[PDB]
Write a protein that binds this ligand. Structure first.
Ligand SMILES: C[C@]12CCC(=O)C[C@@H]1CC[C@@H]1[C@@H]2CC[C@]2(C)[C@@H](O)CC[C@@H]12
Ligand SMILES: O=C(O)Cc1cc(I)c(Oc2ccc(O)c(I)c2)c(I)c1
Lengths: 249, 4
């Protein structure tokens, strides 16, 4: 019974515009300010999405706020790469309908290398032929893939919720294969695909953090929440107090 | 909170 996939397909966030005025010359300040808006806006959907995930509400209230604040980067990035694959075919980074990056914008944003890694991540969806169901499960798993070293208020329930989503992932895979090797290798690819999101997210955390500090020097504006999160939560990740949960080592 |  696909009750679970039912829920994931139903609660999946629709399209979100960054409000970018594609009339303005692609400058550093304009591009990043629009991505910050996109992030702020897209953050709102992430919150509604999560609170709609099976079992998410049961987690403690504080932990609910923490897991979102720690894993939002990786979530938005993962989804972004999906939009780029299914759309612009991965040639470019489909951030929002009104904010699609090309080679030029990648350079002007002062984060060309990171964009390359994201484009590659985007390409992986093709190489691995990730079906839409696999995408959803993996994305859900990402919310539960980064936590504080000290632990959550109720780690007990977190470990169990995480464990379940993983089962769901396996369940998804083993619904077309028959071989003992087939389902096994597929799981290996995905768990790796998932791990690879972490290093990318970590570069953007660093990047946005530095950008925030010298935000007034470069005329880049950070919305209310985006500024608050990058200065309180992100620093815990960069300082190692919050760390991703990797499948492999 | 504010957005939760
Ligand atoms: C999460 C966003 C916005 C949502 C998305 O589609 C992925 C993309 C990845 C780069 C982020 C951007 C939000 C604003 C950030 C954090 C900039 O400050 C630097 C890196 C940007
Ligand atoms: O069997 C299926 O496909 C559906 C399914 C999916 C999940 I995720 C699941 O896990 C929990 C765990 C704790 C909790 O409070 C809640 I609400 C759900 C269970 I149980 C069943």
């Amino acid at each position: 019974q696909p009750i679970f996939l039912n829920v994931l397909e139903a609660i999946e966030p629709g399209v979100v515009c960054a409000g970018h005025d594609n009339n303005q010359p692609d400058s550093f300040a304009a591009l990043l300010s629009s991505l910050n808006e996109l992030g702020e806006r897209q953050l709102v959907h992430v919150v509604k999405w999560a609170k709609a995930l099976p079992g998410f509400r049961n987690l403690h209230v504080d932990d609910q706020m923490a897991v979102i604040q720690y894993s939002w980067m990786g979530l938005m990035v993962f989804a972004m790469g999906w939009r780029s694959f299914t759309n612009v075919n991965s040639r470019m980074l489909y951030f929002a309908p009104d904010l699609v990056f090309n080679e030029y914008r990648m350079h002007k944003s002062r984060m060309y290398s990171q964009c390359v890694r994201m484009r590659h991540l985007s390409q992986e969806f093709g190489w691995l032929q990730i079906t839409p169901q696999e995408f959803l499960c993996m994305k859900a798993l990402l919310l539960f893939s980064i936590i504080p070293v000290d632990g959550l208020k109720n780690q007990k329930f977190f470990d169990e919720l995480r464990m379940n989503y993983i089962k769901e992932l396996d369940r998804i895979i083993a619904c077309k294969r028959k071989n003992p090797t087939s389902c096994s290798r597929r799981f290996y690819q995905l768990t790796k695909l998932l791990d690879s999101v972490q290093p990318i997210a970590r570069e953007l955390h660093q990047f946005t953090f530095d950008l925030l500090i010298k935000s007034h020097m470069v005329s880049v504006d950070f919305p209310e929440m985006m500024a608050e999160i990058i200065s309180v939560q992100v620093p815990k990740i960069l300082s190692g107090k919050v760390k991703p949960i990797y499948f492999h080592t | 909170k504010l957005l939760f």
